[PDB]
Nucleic acid binder design. Sequence first.
DNA 1: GTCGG
DNA 2: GCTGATGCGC
DNA 3: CCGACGGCGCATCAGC
Length: 323
Amino acid sequence: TLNGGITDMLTELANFEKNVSQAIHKYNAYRKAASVIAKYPHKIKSGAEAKKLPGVGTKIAEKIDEFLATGKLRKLEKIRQDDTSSSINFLTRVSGIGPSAARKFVDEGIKTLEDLRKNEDKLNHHQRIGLKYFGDFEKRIPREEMLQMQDIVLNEVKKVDSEYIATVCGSFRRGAESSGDMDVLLTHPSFTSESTKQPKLLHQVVEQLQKVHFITDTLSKGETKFMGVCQLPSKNDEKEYPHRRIDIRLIPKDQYYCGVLYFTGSDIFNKNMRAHALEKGFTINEYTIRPLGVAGEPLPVDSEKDIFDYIQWKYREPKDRSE
DNA sequence: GTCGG
DNA sequence: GCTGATGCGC
DNA sequence: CCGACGGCGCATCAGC
Ligand SMILES: Nc1ccn([C@H]2C[C@H](O)[C@@H](COP(=O)(O)OP(=O)(O)NP(=O)(O)O)O2)c(=O)n1
Ligand SMILES: [Mg+2]
Ligand SMILES: [Mg+2]
């Protein structure tokens, strides 16, 4: 990538602020700057040039000048040397261990993978599964495997009830050649914003995917959101595929376009778009777009493009939403 | 950390 | 048990 | 200056 050295530096700063400092707005600011620089179509020559981009301010411009001049950032070189920052940043890589829990574990002398494995009884269910698949969860998923997973999920959903519609969203729907996980949007005509005419709609699908041994583990599960683990089947004598993260979101069927907009992302694109909506006098969530008067009644939406129209954005195909 | 009013 | 906060994640 | 920063599901806990 054209400015990969810079965007990597900013991401590392973002992670430090989130995981160690617990300064969430600094985390968001660093990721916004990294995002806008990532899509800038020139090799950046100076901090001043970058400060012209929205989300890059004075402090990030100065860091870019240091990085361009020396290839490194003294602030990060010191952070990498610090044992407590290093430990906390490591522990947060386990799914279910956040900044607070990582600092608590370090206080208790739990700070390596070996320590975690020795202290499984001190982990909640989510953390215990995150530890179990720690290596697998850091692997990426080739799009070819995403296509196999898509075929399994859609066909098994079809067998439960041909009226389900399952849509793979996330980075996959944005056309990524690899994904960190699989995100599945689910609808069924019995579940609308006006009524739930059938119970266990999400459960039935989860159950079926467990029955055929696709879903292997559950991190969390409610009426509309499942968060778990899945695995492709392998052939005779074949090494097994890595276990993968899977999220499933049941959305009211009449609210599919707001739901698919949300679940297609990226997260930064959603943040930019919802922030823009506010400046335009609307609020967007995964169910509705509503005017700000306090939020008013939902506006009619019959395509993803209707949502862009309301906030006066030209439409952006999913592949162009990877901010 | 950055931005807009 | 319920409700509201908080952590963690999408 | 300085308030705002997207919006919400599930797990866990504290207080009643
Ligand atoms: N903070 C976040 C995180 C996620 N999402 C939405 C947008 C994202 O596209 C989708 C799925 O989340 P994800 O973490 O799986 O991200 P992804 O875009 O699929 N990328 P990846 O899974 O790493 O390949 O949920 C969001 O709105 N806000
Ligand atoms: Mg994803
Ligand atoms: Mg996901």
